[PDB]
Design a protein around this ligand. Structure first.
Ligand SMILES: CCc1c(-c2csc(N3CCNC[C@@H]3C(=O)NCCc3ccno3)n2)[nH]c(C)c1C(C)=O
Ligand SMILES: [Mg+2]
Length: 103
């Protein structure tokens, strides 16, 4: 319960972050050639929000696993100097820095 309220705060803060715009919704593979082929386990903030809403996270470590997946997928598919890659580095650094000043 302490673990979960922290996840609510971090997710709320990532959802409203300026650099969150690539990660608010699932990537549409119909619009992104090669995405289905390369990214085996898609993840985004709204899927995390839904899982948290239905109580599908048992511990904060599962939440952090999903967050890290978002940024791992991002760095796998996008160039570091791409518009999406640049936002993903800002969001990843934000998440890591928020996570550790809680744990
Ligand atoms: C690069 C695609 C991507 C996004 C993402 C979400 S909105 C968005 N933008 C919309 C405005 N114009 C620039 C860019 C874009 O090209 N949208 C069309 C493709 C699309 C939209 C939604 N789904 O596909 N980009 N987020 C991640 C993690 C991505 C990848 C490839 O990893
Ligand atoms: Mg990692």
């Amino acid at each position: 319960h302490s673990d979960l309220t922290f996840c609510e705060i971090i997710l709320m803060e990532m959802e409203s972050h300026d650099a969150a715009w690539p990660f608010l919704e699932p990537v549409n593979p119909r619009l992104v050639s090669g995405y289905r082929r390369i990214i085996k386990n898609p993840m985004d903030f709204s899927t995390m929000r839904h899982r948290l809403s239905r109580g599908g996270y048992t511990s904060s470590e599962e939440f952090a696993a999903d967050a890290l997946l978002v940024f791992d997928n991002c760095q796998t598919f996008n160039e570091d100097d791409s518009e999406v890659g640049k936002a993903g580095h800002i969001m990843r650094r934000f998440f890591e820095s928020r996570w550790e000043e809680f744990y």
